[PDB]
UniProtKB/Swiss-Prot annotation, chains A, B, C:
Protein task: GFAP, a class-III intermediate filament, is a cell-specific marker that, during the development of the central nervous system, distinguishes astrocytes from other glial cells.
Family under the similarity heading: Belongs to the intermediate filament family.
Residues represented out of the complete protein: 110 to 212 of 432
Tissues where this protein is expressed: Expressed in cells lacking fibronectin.
Source species of the chain: Homo sapiens
Illness association: Alexander disease: A rare disorder of the central nervous system. The most common form affects infants and young children, and is characterized by progressive failure of central myelination, usually leading to death within the first decade. Infants with Alexander disease develop a leukodystrophy with macrocephaly, seizures, and psychomotor retardation. Patients with juvenile or adult forms typically experience ataxia, bulbar signs and spasticity, and a more slowly progressive course.
Region annotation Coil 1B: where it falls in the sequence: 7-103
Cell compartment(s), UniProt: Cytoplasm
Phosphothreonine modification, residue list: T1, T41
Complexes and interactors: Interacts with SYNM.
Protein name: Glial fibrillary acidic protein
Entry comment on modification after translation: Phosphorylated by PKN1.
Length: 103, 103, 103, 101
């Protein structure tokens, strides 16, 4: 009986440990399955957002050129205006002087 | 003797299973740790790629708006130019006339 | 005459502006040439550093697996050690019992 | 009198104005190109700094994983010897016990 008790003691311990490990393993498998599903989703969200970023960044260079050329055209015209208003003022001074000389 | 033999057999089996289950559990914990790490990583990449997308889209919007402002300003200026050129023509005509009369 | 002065004044202003603009344009040409050379340099450095970053990031997953497998192997052995020490303890208990039963 | 002079002066004025219009246009264009090159230079310098930081973190994690593998392997080797020692001990215990009966 003492022999049987020694054996049963070791058996009982091993069965206890085994039951705890099976429980722990089942819980870990559930958590792993969940993390994997969420990882698949967020990877898809990343791919989508990368594609949108990429298209936007591609359009940028052409739009920057459009803006530069439009701004350059505006400036050219503002300068022509300044030139014409300068020309007018000069004409009036020159004209006023010429009419004084004919008196 | 038959009894000890049944016990030693079960003892050997349980130790075999236990070693496999411990290995399996260790592996699962490693897999779970990895999935969690990668999930944190890709979530960060998603956030980054969203921020870059938004900034790109904003720069696109800004370049379109600037061009529009430049084009509208240009058109307004072209009309002021036509006005100034008319004014110049009228000034020369009036002055050429005044010059003829004073002679 | 005053008329000649009016004309010479406008001429003087235009010439000075032209001189100022030519000087500024020469400066700007130099600065543009420099910015372009440096831009080419830093673009090359960027490409190089991107290639290294990319290869490092690619090797990451493989090195993490190497570490995981090495750690898993270690654990398997530490467990086999515990198994053998348990077996020893049990053998001594069983042996002591058998020795008592056989006087 | 002034007619001769006015003609010469108006001609030079016309030339200078034409030149100013061309040079002002060119300068404006150069200013735009310089502003752009500077902007892009700032951009790519930032990308370089970012890419360097990512490279360094990656290389650090590589280094750390290589250290983990080396230490784990060394521990494994030490354990395999302890295993041999324990198996030797077991065999000695069984032979000594079998003798004692």
């Amino acid at each position: 009986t003492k022999l049987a008790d020694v054996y049963q003691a070791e058996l009982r311990e091993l069965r206890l440990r085994l039951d705890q490990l099976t429980a722990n393993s089942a819980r870990l498998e559930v958590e792993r399955d969940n993390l994997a599903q969420d990882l698949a989703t967020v990877r898809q969200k990343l791919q989508d957002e990368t594609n949108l970023r990429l298209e936007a960044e591609n359009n940028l260079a052409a739009y920057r050129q459009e803006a530069d050329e439009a701004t350059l055209a505006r400036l050219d015209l503002e300068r022509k205006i300044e030139s014409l208003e300068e020309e007018i003022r000069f004409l009036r001074k020159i004209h006023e002087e010429e009419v004084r000389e004919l008196q």
